[PDB]
Design an enzyme around this catalytic site. Structure first.
Site, short mmCIF file in Angstrom:
data_model
loop_
_atom_site.label_atom_id
_atom_site.label_comp_id
_atom_site.label_asym_id
_atom_site.label_seq_id
_atom_site.Cartn_x
_atom_site.Cartn_y
_atom_site.Cartn_z
N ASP A 36 17.66 -49.78 3.40
CA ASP A 36 16.10 -49.72 3.98
C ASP A 36 15.69 -51.37 4.33
OD1 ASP A 36 13.41 -48.27 4.50
OD2 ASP A 36 12.47 -49.48 2.55
N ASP A 88 19.25 -38.85 1.86
CA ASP A 88 18.52 -39.39 2.75
C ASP A 88 18.50 -37.69 3.74
OD1 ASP A 88 17.78 -40.13 5.05
OD2 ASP A 88 20.14 -41.61 5.63
N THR A 147 12.62 -47.19 8.17
CA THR A 147 11.56 -49.06 8.72
C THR A 147 12.10 -49.85 9.85
OG1 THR A 147 12.65 -49.66 7.06
CG2 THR A 147 11.44 -48.27 6.31
N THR A 148 13.50 -50.10 9.31
CA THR A 148 14.61 -50.14 10.30
C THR A 148 13.99 -50.57 11.98
OG1 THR A 148 16.56 -49.75 9.88
CG2 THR A 148 15.65 -51.30 8.62
#
Lengths: 517, 57, 514, 508, 72
Positions: C50, C380, C83-84
């Protein structure tokens, strides 16, 4: 800081493992060489054990920390298997880097090892999947503790240690539970003993002995007083010690401490327990009153160890003096202060046979190393023996299996159109450094050495014979008896390949420098 | 103060307590001995072979 | 003093430093994608794929560097996922407008026109969005599973997913009605069957302290009246730390039999206020544990408050900083307490709890360092399975939609411009880079793969996309390579503006100038 | 941590022990050139040292490799005698030996086993070269002597070494297999006598008894006490502390005079004129005890009580209070004598026997120290002389025979290890070289020949490095226990072999 | 020349020739020790005496000039 990626950290990865692995591969196995390693404390530690080398090092990179910790699993799990899982883990980096240098993406090569790590552990499975019980295994266990005890170069006559490890592990780690249990093994031993002097005492042996020789040196069966009660300074978590400054203050200090311990030693003896083992043991003043009331009893015991005489002895617990009752007492089969022939090692056995909930190996040696020598010898024996006691699964080691494993995969590599054949090759190609590095520690041509076995593994199509792990000239893993738990043989693989994989998925590095431990 | 310097002060003081005289005289023949050793060690002669020569002297 | 700097030198110093921090996120987030190792400060090490996790731990000096910090968090505060990707996109535009700023030409309309396709994209996104709810059953546990299957293998586990996805199924439904992500806590062990995780609604307990015999101490209760306790139970209890001492005459034996009283009192204060299993968030003393042994009442110590909380939410109970337990809701209870060892460590299972939407997983990884990402794959999946629940409309994963959107803009790259095709050519291309990052960070040919998709995207194909284990052309929606459309929508919002924002600023004041 | 690697650590293992293996071997061999220990590191001083540990130990060891040898050769010295010189050099020699092999990289597997076998070869060759001279007791006396002669030799002692030629042999004989300071109790004291030492009757102690006590007592029944006074005896009332102001500071020192007197009373319950204790007093208490009639004989020798108790039938014990817990003893006479300028009280009436006392008179403590150590090594090696009466000719004859017998074995037996096995033999012949220069005499023409010479069978013949000549090691009496010689073969191999197996040194 | 173990093989052929072995030598063709019966690698007394001759001279003759006067 700096994000250091590409070959930058890929070096910082491949960098650390090599300095680490080599002292381990030069210390690898019995032919592995014994490395004096001195602290900043100025203290010589001679380490032929990679794990002990790992215990001695912390090399600066995050993996070199974790590699020290990597073997500890299989060192806890399997005992033996500490050195090989690391030394080869760096060889993959050698393999992998060249493979990335071949242009193969890092995650590509990263995956193929694990992908090929199947046959690695899977080809092992086919050698001995066997299972035996304690009295059966004890021969394979001593036969494996021919190698495991001898892995510290102390197996001689130490089938004593093997055979006490036979019945130690099954006691604590049951063959049916198949769960790792060393907890009820009570590690015990003292400097000054002998390698040839070693004992498995099924009960608990406490350091303290009888408060007087005038009082009997035998406490009868059971009837032990398990208590937390002060017979000396109590030593709680925090209290400050104030002494007496006066003549009129000195006299009464002797009377009171006489008056309570008598009643207490009375009440304990009146409770009917002929050994009082007190979590707060005896001062020298409580000893003579103990002799006044004439009861055999024990001086200062460690806090939890009075529980260790509650668990191991099956005696139902009385926590403290205030609750004394004849029903709940400590148990002992026989209470004896025992000298083993070295009075330097002297213990009072609280003996457990019928109910023994902590089995106690008692190890001996002339020096701090020699015990530890025998300790890490038998303890790594103990774990492989534990592995074998649950399921007795062995292989003919020292690279004789590494070659035979190198056959299938490197073969199976090209069977696949997939890129990972190169990994699978380099996977099966990375396997054989162990007999190589062994032959180097064995002081032979390492290069033909491996192929001598593949010439065999051509002929053999199986590890049985091998090269010289003992430098004794018989080229065997069989009649040389290089025999080790096939479990731990598979533990090195999964630990080595899958750790490196996790090392490999990370080229992404945020550190102030390159390699930060 | 030097490894061979400390024996000198000694050497001086001894001849006093040895005699009461010759305090300088023990050192005046000290450097006398200190030379001959060289030519010998310059001749290469072994120092312990040179050693008992002092006795013989 | 105080600093301020305008100018293209600073405005490019803006964009340069802006693309510096995206370095982290511009590797990771893929199954063959990368994780990140950030070892910061005192030698503190962190492994997080993350970005929004590590990026905030990493140094960001610049307003642009700090502007993208929340951009990753912006997607992190949304799905907790992606996020990335949202951060990678912003820096891409800067590479694309980099000619224009080196051309020196930026009418503020260029960034103002970034918002146009940003809408139009997230339009087409939610346009092409298709609900998975009524599409998959009613219970929707196949909605869960086929989102569980493909979201377990989008990071690590493509084998266990056959076994695990169906557990990722029922764990989502059970836990959901409570959005707590603690109650799905997975228990790692080894020595049992590795790569085999069992879903157990009851909470296994890592730690309990029981000695003075383990078989004279009850390890199981079929009505635990659960002492959920923050209390420490100390080895020896002194009366005072001052105006008392030890031995100087009378208190030798006087303190000790009195020392026992507070423990006789306080260790019982748990018992008479009720308990069977005593869960103390803090340790239990040895002669105190002898006490609890002598009391035949299960005692635990150093218990994680979270295990207490999952139980607290399982019992309808609560933790107690008081040894006094004054109610069943401030105390706790269950209809099962069982100590057992799966993997070789003592578990305390509370099962059949008064509530227990907790889903505990007893998991075993193939090895030491390999064991963790399975759980990260489990959660996830659990996240986007729940996120496929928390958003009905779930589109094709693996950057399947962006390629069409590029051509959808390559339409406008033809259609729109008096000028702005320069944008529409630039802007759209940056989309395709994020799944390109996967083929990249997996070492497979994005352009090839992406354009092999584009030939069929030329056919009008939309959900055509990449299966990111092989990095191969496919239809991600049908492959159930998925994320909800809002997740797609949420991405273009921030990443477009961050470029727009930092462009509007050529000037950063430093008031302290320190 | 900090890991020394294959390159440095072993060359460091090479140099350090070799750097410490240089100085004592100059001192070593017949007419060994003395090392001068230079103390500039503590004081600034010169020290003349043939002594291995005095060379070794007085220099603190830093290098990890310098540790082990100085450590191993040290215990080898306390055990087997003069091991600090041998095992240091011998291992450092083998370290000098390994290097060419290591320069050739002879496998660390190969060298250890190669030197392992050749160690036996020399140990067996030493054994082969070892023959009992102790076949007859008087021969065994001489065998003890001839072996002590190699043990006692080459020290700064003069009448001591000769006094301990008989004294070790006398003690080792009447102990029948042992050697001890219990059979002979060493008293090292000052006196006009330089190296002169004799066997004491009873025992003597260094102090003068003045004041009102007569300096000599007749019909002395010894009351032995491990207990005594510090001039203050801790008890119930002895804890009085009145000090607050400066006046109580003035009053407190005077209470000590009150404390000294009651201590005399506990001995009077015993009713004996002669009370010996292991503890001491001042003159002012000496004024108290002779007045009460019970004479305080203070700080009795721990060995002195043992000296009497062994001969007098008394018992040694601990925690004296009343005469019953420690058996009484009897000296014919308790007297004080004039020894040189030293005035000593002396117990006697029992002469020699099982337990003896050995008074060592010297100008310095230097001449006193070697005598107990030269005996220390003698007694043990002469105890070894009982186990093996084998005395193999020292001064290189034992050495130059071993490497020979090693050689032929070092040849065909290895197909490789001649690398090691012969390098082993080389070190055996190195000790005769470092003496030959110290003798000024040629090593080469000597060694290879004189070895072969006596390895072709002149065993009495050997290396006389007093004169530097090929000489008879029998008539010179240069020969020593096969034990003491076998044992220094045992340690030094390891001290060289151990750090060879060390290719890496981690520093945590 | 072959790249095999001189250490072993020689000291093996020494272990052969310590006791003496007149029948065997180290075959660099084979890489392993081999017969000299004239196994074919056994060579004439003519050469191996004279090869021993000439260089035995020169070495000691090289020893013979300590003094060298070089006028170039």
């Amino acid at each position: 800081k700096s994000r250091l990626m590409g070959l930058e950290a890929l070096k910082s990865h491949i960098m650390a493992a090599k300095a680490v692995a080599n002292t381990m591969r030069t210390s690898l196995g019995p032919n592995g060489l014994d490395k004096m390693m001195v602290d900043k404390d100025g203290d010589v530690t001679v380490t032929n054990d990679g794990a002990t080398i790992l215990s001695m090092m912390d090399v600066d990179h995050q993996i070199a920390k974790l590699m020290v910790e990597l073997s500890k699993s299989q060192d806890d799990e399997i005992g033996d298997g500490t050195t090989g899982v690391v030394v080869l883990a760096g060889a993959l980096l050698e393999e992998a880097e060249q493979l990335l240098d071949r242009g193969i993406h890092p995650i590509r090569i990263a995956d193929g090892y694990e992908q090929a790590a199947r046959v690695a552990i899977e080809h092992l499975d086919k050698i001995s999947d066997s299972v035996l019980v304690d009295i059966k295994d004890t021969e394979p266990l001593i036969q494996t503790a021919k190698t495991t005890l001898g892995s510290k170069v102390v197996n001689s006559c130490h089938r004593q240690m093997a055979e006490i490890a036979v019945n130690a592990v099954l006691t604590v780690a049951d063959m049916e539970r198949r769960d790792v249990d060393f907890e009820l093994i009570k590690v015990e031993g003292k400097v000054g003993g002998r390698l040839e002097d070693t004992k498995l005492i099924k009960g608990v042996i406490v350091d303290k002995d009888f408060s007087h020789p005038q009082m009997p040196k035998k406490v009868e069966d059971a009837k032990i007083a398990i208590l937390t009660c002060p017979f000396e300074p109590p030593k709680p978590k925090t209290k400050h010690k104030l002494d007496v400054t006066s003549v009129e203050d000195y006299k009464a200090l002797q009377k009171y401490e006489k008056e309570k311990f008598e009643e207490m030693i009375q009440q304990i003896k009146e409770t009917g327990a002929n050994l009082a083992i007190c979590q707060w043991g005896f001062d020298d003043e409580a000893n003579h009153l103990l002799l006044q009331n004439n009861l055999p009893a024990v001086r200062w015991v460690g806090g939890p160890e009075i529980e260790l005489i509650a668990i191991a002895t099956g005696g139902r617990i009385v926590p403290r003096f205030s609750e004394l009752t004849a029903e709940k007492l400590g148990f002992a089969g026989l209470v004896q202060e025992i000298s083993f022939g070295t009075t330097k090692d002297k213990m009072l056995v609280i003996e457990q046979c019928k109910n023994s909930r902590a089995v106690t190996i008692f190890i001996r040696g002339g020096n701090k190393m020699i015990i530890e020598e025998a300790k890490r010898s038998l303890h790594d024996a103990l774990c492989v023996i534990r592995n074998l006691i649950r399921d007795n699964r062995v292989v003919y080691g020292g690279g004789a299996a590494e070659i035979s494993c190198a056959l299938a995969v490197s073969q199976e590599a090209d069977k696949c159109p997939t890129l990972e054949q190169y990994a699978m090759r380099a996977f099966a190609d990375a396997l054989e450094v162990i007999p190589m590095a062994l032959s180097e520690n064995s002081g032979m041509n390492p290069i033909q050495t491996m192929t001598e076995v593949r010439a065999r593994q051509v002929k053999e199509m199986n590890p049985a014979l091998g090269i010289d792990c003992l430098h004794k000239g018989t080229n065997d893993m069989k009649q040389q008896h290089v025999i080790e738990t096939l479990i731990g043989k598979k533990q090195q693989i999964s630990l080595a390949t899958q750790m490196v994989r996790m090392i490999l998925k990370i080229d992404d590095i945020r550190k102030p420098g390159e390699s930060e431990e | 103060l030097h490894p061979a310097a400390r024996m000198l002060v000694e050497l001086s003081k001894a001849q006093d307590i040895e005699a009461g005289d010759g305090t300088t005289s023990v050192v005046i023949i000290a450097g006398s001995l200190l030379d001959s050793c060289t030519k010998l060690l310059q001749k290469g002669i072994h120092p312990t072979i040179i050693s008992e020569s002092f006795q013989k002297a | 003093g105080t600093d301020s700097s305008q100018g293209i030198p600073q405005l490019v110093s803006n964009i340069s430093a802006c693309q510096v921090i995206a370095e982290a996120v511009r590797t990771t987030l893929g199954p063959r994608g990368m994780d990140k190792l950030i070892v910061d400060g005192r030698g503190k090490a962190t492994i997080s794929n993350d970005g929004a996790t590590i990026l905030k731990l990493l140094d960001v000096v610049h307003p642009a560097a700090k502007t993208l910090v929340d951009i990753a968090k912006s997607q992190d505060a949304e799905v907790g996922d992606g996020t990335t990707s949202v951060t990678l996109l912003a820096a891409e535009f800067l590479k694309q407008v980099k000619p224009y700023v080196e051309e020196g030409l930026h009418p503020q309309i260029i960034i103002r026109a970034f918002r146009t396709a940003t809408q139009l994209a997230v339009n087409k996104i939610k346009e092409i969005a298709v609900t998975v709810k009524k599409a998959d059953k009613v219970e929707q546990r196949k909605l869960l599973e086929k989102c569980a299957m493909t979201a377990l293998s989008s990071k690590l586990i493509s084998q266990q997913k056959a076994f695990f996805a169906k557990m990722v199924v029922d764990a989502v439904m059970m836990l959901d009605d409570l959005l707590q992500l603690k109650m799905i806590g997975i228990k790692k062990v080894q020595g049992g069957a590795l790569e085999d995780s069992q879903l157990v609604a009851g909470v296994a307990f890592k730690k309990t302290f029981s000695y003075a015999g383990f078989e004279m101490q009850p390890k199981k209760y079929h009505n635990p009246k659960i002492a959920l306790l923050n209390v420490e139970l100390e080895l020896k209890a002194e009366k005072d730390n001052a105006e008392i001492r030890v031995h100087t005459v009378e208190d030798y034996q006087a303190i000790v039999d009195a020392e026992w009283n507070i423990l006789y009192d306080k260790l019982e204060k748990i018992h008479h206020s009720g308990a069977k299993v005593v869960l103390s968030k803090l340790p239990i003393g040895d002669v105190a544990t002898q006490y609890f042994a002598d009391r035949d009442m299960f005692c635990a110590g150093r218990v994680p408050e979270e295990d207490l909380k999952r139980t607290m939410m399982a019992c309808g109970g609560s933790i107690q900083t008081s040894v006094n337990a004054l109610s069943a809701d401030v105390l706790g209870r269950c209809q099962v307490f069982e100590e057992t060892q799966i993997g070789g460590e003592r578990y305390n299972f509370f099962t059949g709890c008064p509530k227990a939407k907790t889903c505990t997983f007893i998991l075993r990884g193939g090895a030491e360092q390999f064991m963790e990402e399975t759980e990260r794959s489990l959660h996830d999946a659990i996240m986007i399975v729940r996120r496929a629940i928390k958003n009905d409309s779930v589109v094709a994963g693996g950057g399947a939609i962006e390629m069409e959107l590029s051509k959808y803009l390559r339409d406008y790259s033809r259609t729109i411009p008096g000028k702005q095709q320069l944008l529409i050519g630039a802007y759209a291309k940056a989309l395709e880079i994020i799944p390109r990052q996967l083929c990249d960070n997996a070492g497979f040919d994005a352009t090839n793969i992406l354009n092999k998709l584009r030939a069929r995207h030329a056919q009008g194909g939309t959900w055509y996309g990449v299966d990111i284990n092989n990095e191969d052309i496919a239809d991600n929606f049908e492959a159930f390579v998925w994320e909800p459309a809002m997740v797609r929508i949420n991405a273009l919002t921030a990443a477009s503006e961050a470029a727009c924002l930092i462009v509007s600023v050529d000037e950063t004041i430093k008031n302290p100038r320190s | 941590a900090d890991e020394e690697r294959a390159e440095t650590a072993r060359l460091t293992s090479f140099i350090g022990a070799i750097a410490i293996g240089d100085l004592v071997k100059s001192t070593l061999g017949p007419k060994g050139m003395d090392k001068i220990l230079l103390s500039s590191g503590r004081d600034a001083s010169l020290m003349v040292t043939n002594d291995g540990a005095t060379i070794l130990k007085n220099i603190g060891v830093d290098n990890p490799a310098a540790k082990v040898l100085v450590d191993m050769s040290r215990v080898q010295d306390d055990e087997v005698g003069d091991g600090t010189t041998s095992v240091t050099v011998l291992a450092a020699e083998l370290l000098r030996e390994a290097e060419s092999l290591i320069a050739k990289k002879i496998h660390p597997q190969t060298i250890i086993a190669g030197w392992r076998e050749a160690t036996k070869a020399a140990r067996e060759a030493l054994l082969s070269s070892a023959v009992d001279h102790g076949s007859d007791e008087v021969k065994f006396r001489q065998d003890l002597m001839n072996i002590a002669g190699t043990t006692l030799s080459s020290k700064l002692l003069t009448h001591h070494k000769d006094h301990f030629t008989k004294l070790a042999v006398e003690a080792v004989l009447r102990l029948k297999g042992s050697g001890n300071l219990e059979a002979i109790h060493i008293i090292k004291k000052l006196g006009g006598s330089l190296a002169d030492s004799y066997l004491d009757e009873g025992f003597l102690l260094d102090k003068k008894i003045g004041v009102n006590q007569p300096k000599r007592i007749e019909n002395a029944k010894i009351l032995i006490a491990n207990t005594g006074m510090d001039t203050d005896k801790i008890k119930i009332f002895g804890s009085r502390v009145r000090v607050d102001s400066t006046a109580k500071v003035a009053e407190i020192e005077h209470a000590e005079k009150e404390k000294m007197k009651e201590k005399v009373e506990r001995i009077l319950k015993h009713g004996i004129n002669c009370f010996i204790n292991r503890q001491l007093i001042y003159n002012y208490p000496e004024q108290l005890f002779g007045a009460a009639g019970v004479m305080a004989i203070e700080h009795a020798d721990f060995a002195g009580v043992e000296r009497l108790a062994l001969v007098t039938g008394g018992e040694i014990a601990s925690t004296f209070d009343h005469p019953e817990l420690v058996k009484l003893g009897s000296c014919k006479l308790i007297e004080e004598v004039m020894i040189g300028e030293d005035k000593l009280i002396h117990f006697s009436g029992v002469a020699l026997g099982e337990a003896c006392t050995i008074v060592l008179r010297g100008a310095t403590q230097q001449i006193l120290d070697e005598a107990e150590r030269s005996l220390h090594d003698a007694l043990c090696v002469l105890a070894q002389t009982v186990k093996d009466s084998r005395t193999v000719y020292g001064g290189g004859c034992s050495e130059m025979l071993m490497a020979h017998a090693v050689t032929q074995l070092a040849n065909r037996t290895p197909g490789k290890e001649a690398v090691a096995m012969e390098s082993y033999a080389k070190a055996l012949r190195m000790l005769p070289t470092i003496i030959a220069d110290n003798a000024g005499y040629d090593s080469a023409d000597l060694v290879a020949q004189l070895r072969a010479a006596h390895s072709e069978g002149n065993t009495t013949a050997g290396l006389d490095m007093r004169e530097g000549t090929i000489g008879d090691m029998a008539i010179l009496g240069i020969t020593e226990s096969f034990q003491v010689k076998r044992q220094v073969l045992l340690s030094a191999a390891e001290a060289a072999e151990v750090i060879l197996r060390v290719d890496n040194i981690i520093k945590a | 020349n072959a790249g095999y173990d001189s250490a072993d093989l020689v000291a093996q052929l020494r272990a052969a020739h310590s006791e003496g072995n007149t029948t065997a030598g180290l075959d660099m063709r084979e890489g392993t020790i081999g017969d000299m019966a004239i196994l074919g690698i056994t060579e004439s007394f003519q050469v191996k005496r004279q090869v021993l001759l000439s260089a035995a001279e020169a070495a000691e003759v090289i020893l013979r000039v300590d003094n060298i006067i070089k006028a170039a």
